Amino acid sequence: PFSKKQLKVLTWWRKASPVSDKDGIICDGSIRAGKTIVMSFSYVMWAMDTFNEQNFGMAGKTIGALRRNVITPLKRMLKSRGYRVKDHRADNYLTITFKGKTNYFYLFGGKDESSQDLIQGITLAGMFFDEVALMPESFVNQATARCSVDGAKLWFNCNPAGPYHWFKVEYLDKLDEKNLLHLHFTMDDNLSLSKQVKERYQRMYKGVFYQRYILGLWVLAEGIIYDMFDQDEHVVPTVPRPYEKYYVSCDYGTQNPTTFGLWGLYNGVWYKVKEYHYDGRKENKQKTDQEYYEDLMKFIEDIEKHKFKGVIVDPSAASFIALLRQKGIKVIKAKNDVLDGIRNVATALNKKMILYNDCCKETFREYSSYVWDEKAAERGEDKPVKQNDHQLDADRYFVNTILF
Ligand code: NA
């Protein structure tokens, strides 16, 4: 059963609704509020019921994201209601058909050259944006220009970012200038949800990420990024444990410091067993790929190599990655998303999926100083100051690639 606010998303556009004159809808707020899937479900229903033989856009951060977030559950949900769907996977569009009417649903990604090629010359009767805060503004300005058909409606879905983000400033602060409907979603508005489940999700977030992703507020990112890092909780003695599995995580720099960190699984908790930290500036000598490889072997001398599951490493360290693969070391290219990895590291800290041996001294010094970019947040870009973040980037590469 859908909530009252979920049903307002499904029914705002119908003739009987008192808000059907609006040029579109903005649904934002918390995670797991049942807004994305029903918003997309309503979008298609609206488009099938209102036009015939027209084009409709649906957009995500990338197309793969858009498919796993939106299209996959949207398809099964459409099929069970009697909508016949033909997913044209390679061409990235769909045809949907219902009561004799047929429309075409093109899939886009904000950061894709295929998408930015097709968005130049297409005529649309509506546009849908999932994760709209994560997309580039220029793409969204250009996408809305392609909605020239008579009676086109723009639909926007996202999670909160900062107060100076272009979507807050240009769209949410100018609702009635653009004749847009706005509905805000907390976890109260998803009925398939016990408090036990809701209060479990409350425990996962603290600070800015709690205020954004649980409360649904557009709060500014300021000061200490991991302000939930407690040494009462996350630090442990440096003693041996019978670990069942291992990884090494790597932040690479000849210019800057290089860092290895050894991770070990024990009772469903990952432990940063030890750290390596070489800085060429302060040591007054720089290391080659070969020398770091030699250190990496010394660094993993003692662990049983059937338990060692490989090395995680930055995408921009390919001469190191090439060398390691000639030595037959399994290398995982790190996922590399900065804001999503910072979120997951913080969640792994809150949940205590990770702990740290008290020998990880450089990592703790970096926790105390890693801060948000004050000047960038006031433009609307949430990002760290990239200074003393080498152990913390390696740790992020680990948590985001293996845990999440
Ligand atoms: Na670094």
UniProtKB/TrEMBL annotation:
Q: Which domain of life is it from?
A: Viruses
Coiled-coil residues: none
Per UniProt, ADP binds at Q6, R32, A33, G34, K35, T36, I37, N190
Signal peptide extent: none
* Keyword list, A-Z: Nucleotide-binding
Presence of keyword Zinc:
no
Its recorded name reads Large subunit terminase
Q: Which organism is it from?
A: Deep-sea thermophilic phage D6E
Question: What taxonomic lineage is listed for the species of origin?
Answer: Viruses, Duplodnaviria, Heunggongvirae, Uroviricota, Caudoviricetes
